Ligand binder design. Structure first.
Ligand SMILES: CC(=O)N[C@H]1[C@H]([C@H](O)[C@H](O)CO)O[C@](O)(C(=O)O)C[C@@H]1O
Ligand code: NA
Length: 601
């Protein structure tokens, strides 16, 4: 295990006949050839851009690549046709290879109309190309009618990247390709499309979830099928669900907080696809996405050793731009990684020695303290490695003027290990919530986690709305309580859905749950609208809840998206009130995403 990481460009925007290349799919043929597929985009856009599905082949394990060839050719003139968003699926029992993609004419995903007739240009069709000669030549089929059991499903696309064939269970041999559909209610849902006859016929299973999008599946160590999805509702994380029936139907969808995502595609595969059911090796998954929540950047590989329950292991492969990626397992024990660096489509090859992980997921809880204080938090390491590590270390990534150190007891096979982290925060430090990184470093590899240190802010969990002048709840979720949920994506909104609703001034008052020394209020505006922004304000406080002292602070907030501080000399108070005197440009309504209170718990 000498570490290996290499890359090379396969398509470069503005070279070889297209101004833009995106949307990677990668597989290994029954004869060991690597196939890389992707869009060529004549007008640089998603469907219904007149796109082509392209393919390059490597016959030497990915070292060198042959000519760019056209699998499905778009038409830029009469009539306009596009083929976009490839996904490979190899039937390893028959040798047959499929490449799923859209067939667009007038409409893409958003515009597609109900119907399944291949001649209808108002439908985004579902196509599949089939090859029986290792991807040299292809025949083409439209399968929309076959995969549309509900005439309310007006639009669909196969998730680009690579589908799977089940190896375990009563449904062994089944081919599974994930799609996103839009139903008659307008929701985006995930669904598995599958074949039990080696691609002769395809059908849709039961749709799952809401706020879904491009999504992927993988067969777990016990033969359940794990679904991992882009979140069209923009949580900043991946969504997950599990099937016990070979991908036909799924349970409840949940967010996976250990998988940050900027709302984009990602890949998940078995590290050991031939490992037997129930084995340790069968539990190992690899994952690729952009780890940034704020841009398509910080492309990262992660590894789970427990069927995707935890993700102890991570390493950055692309610190810069990284706007799509797909993983495949190579015959030589390494992994291919076909991704978008911003320059087109790039092929990378890495091994597990490069990734450098140990299967030892660990936890550190979130902690609160005051500036000028120290606190110690416990560490719990679950050793899934099966080996002893006599001298593990813990390395923390925190503000450079803080003092942070930690330690962990030796790792033992099959056991939990304990540790600790002490944090000292200097006097004066600005109140806020501070993310802190932690890396378990061992001779056998590394694992990591993160936790939040809250400094100088009261506990929102003890706070409640004492009073508010107005709130919208009829047409949207504008609850006053939204200010104290720690989420900048949810907001208090004053009532707007009745004409008689009040205009300015507005007012929101918090019960802190108890009397505290306080010295500040932090305000965060509504993030996705500019027309209900607080401008002029006064802050008042109360020891007993009806008699208000103040203004203790006044001013005019800005249009900054970040927390804005209104500070005041320290005073004891059970209640704090924000009077919103005015809106930035005189609109009627007030919205606030967050309020936090600077004080001593
Ligand atoms: C058929 C189609 O439109 N595919 C496009 C998808 C969807 O539009 C989407 O995920 C729907 O919400 O978006 C991309 O992944 C994207 O965000 O860059 C590009 C991809 O080509
Ligand atoms: Na909020």
């Amino acid at each position: 295990g000498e570490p290996l990481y290499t890359e090379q460009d396969l398509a470069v925007n503005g070279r070889e006949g297209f101004p833009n290349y995106r949307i990677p799919a990668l597989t290994v043929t029954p004869d060991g050839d690597l196939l890389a597929s992707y869009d060529g985009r004549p007008t640089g856009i998603d469907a219904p851009g007149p796109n082509s599905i392209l393919q390059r082949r490597s016959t030497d394990g990915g070292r060198t690549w042959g000519e760019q060839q056209v699998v499905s050719a778009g038409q830029t003139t009469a009539p306009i046709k596009g083929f976009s968003d490839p996904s490979y699926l190899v039937d390893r029992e028959t040798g047959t290879i499929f490449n799923f993609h859209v067939y667009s004419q007038r409409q893409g995903f958003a515009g597609s109309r109900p119907g399944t007739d291949p001649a209808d240009p108002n439908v985004l069709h579902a196509n599949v190309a089939t090859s029986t000669d290792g991807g040299l030549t292809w025949s083409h089929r439209t399968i929309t009618a076959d995969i549309t059991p509900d005439p309310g499903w007006r639009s669909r696309f196969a998730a680009s990247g690579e589908g799977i064939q089940l190896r375990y269970g009563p449904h062994a041999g089944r081919l599974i390709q994930q799609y996103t559909i839009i139903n008659a209610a307008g929701a985006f849902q995930a669904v598995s499309v599958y074949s039990d006859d080696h691609g002769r016929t395809w059908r849709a299973g039961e749709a799952v979830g809401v706020g879904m999008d491009e999504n992927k599946t993988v067969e777990l160590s016990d033969g359940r099928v794990l679904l991992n999805s882009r979140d069209s509702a923009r949580s900043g994380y991946r969504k997950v669900a599990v099937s016990t029936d070979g991908g036909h139907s799924y349970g409840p969808v949940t967010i996976d907080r250990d998988l940050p995502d900027p709302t984009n595609n990602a890949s998940i595969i078995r590290a050991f696809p031939d490992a037997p059911a129930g084995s340790a090796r069968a539990k190992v998954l690899l994952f690729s996405n952009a780890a940034s929540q704020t841009s398509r950047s910080q492309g990262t590989i992660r590894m789970s050793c427990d069927d995707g329950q935890t993700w102890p292991v991570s390493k950055v492969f692309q610190p810069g731009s990284m706007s799509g990626s797909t993983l495949t397992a190579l015959p030589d024990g390494t992994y291919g990684l076909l991704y978008e660096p911003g320059t087109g489509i790039r092929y990378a090859n890495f091994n597990l020695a490069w990734l450098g992980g140990i299967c030892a997921p660990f936890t550190i809880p979130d902690v609160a303290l005051e500036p000028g204080q120290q606190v110690t938090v416990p560490v719990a390491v679950t050793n899934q490695s099966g080996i002893a590590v006599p001298k593990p270390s813990l390395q923390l990534d925190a503000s450079p003027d803080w003092q942070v150190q930690g330690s962990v007891e030796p790792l033992m096979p099959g056991r939990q290990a304990k540790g600790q982290v002490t944090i000292t925060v200097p006097a004066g430090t600005t109140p806020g919530r501070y993310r802190v990184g932690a890396t378990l470093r061992t001779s056998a590899g590394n694992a990591s986690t993160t936790f939040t240190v809250t400094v100088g802010l009261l506990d929102q969990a003890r706070m409640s709305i004492a009073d508010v002048d107005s709130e919208e709840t009829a047409r949207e979720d504008g609850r006053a309580s939204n200010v104290i949920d720690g989420n900048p994506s949810t907001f208090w909104h004053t009532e707007w859905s009745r004409a008689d609703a009040p205009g300015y001034p507005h007012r929101i008052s918090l019960d802190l749950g108890g009397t505290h020394t306080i010295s500040g209020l932090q305000y965060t505006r509504r993030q996705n609208s500019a027309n209900e922004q607080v401008a002029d304000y006064e802050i008042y406080t109360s020891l007993n809840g009806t008699t208000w002292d103040g203004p203790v602070a006044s001013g005019r907030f800005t249009t900054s998206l970040a927390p804005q501080r209104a500070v005041f000399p320290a005073r004891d108070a059970r209640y704090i009130r924000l009077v919103a005197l005015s809106e930035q440009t005189g609109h009627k309504y007030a919205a606030v995403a967050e309020l936090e209170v600077e004080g001593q718990r």
